[PDB]
């Protein structure tokens, strides 16, 4: 509630600028697609993968300094970040490639879960006080449906 920053059109586009070596390109594309699908279902927004610098949400993996002014910190600590909606850097989502990206139970962080969390930020969502919620600021691996009442109440407040 320093805003509320939101997108001002429904058909949001995204560009996967570059890839991590941790997973196959196809797997990465799918993790990101699944992560948008979670928000797609609960909002009037649609997400279209495009191959253009002019996409609303540009996705990159970057280690340390990746030229937006906000260095990653090597392994652990900061996992990723996303800028709230608006023009340019705003809306973009950056994943620290000093982390080990994976999917499923085990090593590293689920690219899916972390992307779903970053994309909530890329839609204008802040952190939730609810510990189970996707937008709670602490990563916990879960096999369960990632969205909870508080996440859905949050986007509904913005787009609903």
73 binds, among ligand 0ZD, Zn ion, a second copy, none (CB under 5 to 8 A by kind): a second copy
Instruction: Kindly tell me which residue out of 44, 77, 137, 160 binds Zn ion, with binding defined by CB under 5 A.
Output: 137
User: What part of residues 8-37 is at the interface with Zn ion (CB under 5 A)?
Assistant: none
Rounded CA gap, 24 and 108, in Å? Answer: 15
Query: In Å, how far are 4, 44, 68, 113, 153 from 142, measured between CA atoms?
Result: 29, 26, 31, 9, 20
Instruction: Kindly tell me which residue out of 33, 79, 130, 158 binds ligand 0ZD, with binding defined by CB under 6 A.
Output: 79
139 binds, among ligand 0ZD, Zn ion, Ca ion, none (CB under 5 to 8 A by kind): ligand 0ZD
Which residue has tokens 């986007």? Answer: 155
Determine if residue 18 is left, alpha or beta; phi over 0 gives left, psi from -120 to 50 gives alpha, anything else beta: beta
CA dihedral 122, 124, 126, 132 (to 10 degrees): -70
Query: Binding to Zn ion by residue 65, rule CB under 5 A?
Result: no
Instruction: Kindly tell me which residue out of 13, 112, 117, 155 binds ligand 0ZD, with binding defined by CB under 6 A.
Output: 117
Instruction: Kindly tell me which residue out of 42, 78, 130, 158 binds a second copy, with binding defined by CB under 8 A.
Output: 78
Smallest gap from residue 81 Cβ to a second copy (A): 11
Rounded CA gap, 52 and 8, in Å? Answer: 19
Q: State both tokens at 71.
A: 């260095």
Residues 54 and 70 sit within 8 Å (Cβ to Cβ): no
* Segment lying near a second copy (by CB under 8 A), choices 4-12, 42-50, 56-64, 131-139: 131-139
- Judged by the rule CB under 6 A, the positions of this chain that interact with ligand 0ZD are 78-82, 113-114, 117-118, 121, 127, 134, 136-139
Site residues for a second copy per CB under 8 A: 73, 77-78, 137-140
């Amino acid at each position: 509630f320093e805003g509320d920053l939101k997108w001002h059109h429904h058909n949001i586009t995204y560009w996967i600028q570059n890839y991590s070596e941790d997973l196959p390109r196809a797997v990465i594309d799918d993790a990101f697609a699944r992560a948008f699908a979670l928000w797609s279902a609960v909002t009037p927004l649609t997400f279209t993968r495009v191959y253009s610098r002019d996409a609303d949400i540009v996705i990159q993996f970057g280690v340390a300094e990746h030229g937006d002014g906000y260095p990653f910190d090597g392994k652990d600590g900061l996992l990723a970040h996303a800028f709230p909606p608006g023009p340019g850097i705003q809306g973009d989502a950056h994943f620290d490639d000093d982390e080990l990206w994976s999917l499923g139970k085990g090593q590293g962080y689920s690219l899916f879960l972390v992307a779903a969390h970053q994309f909530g930020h890329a839609l204008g969502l802040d952190h939730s006080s609810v510990p189970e919620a996707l937008m709670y600021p602490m990563y916990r691996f879960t096999e369960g449906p990632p969205l909870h009442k508080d996440d859905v109440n949050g986007i509904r407040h913005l787009y609903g």
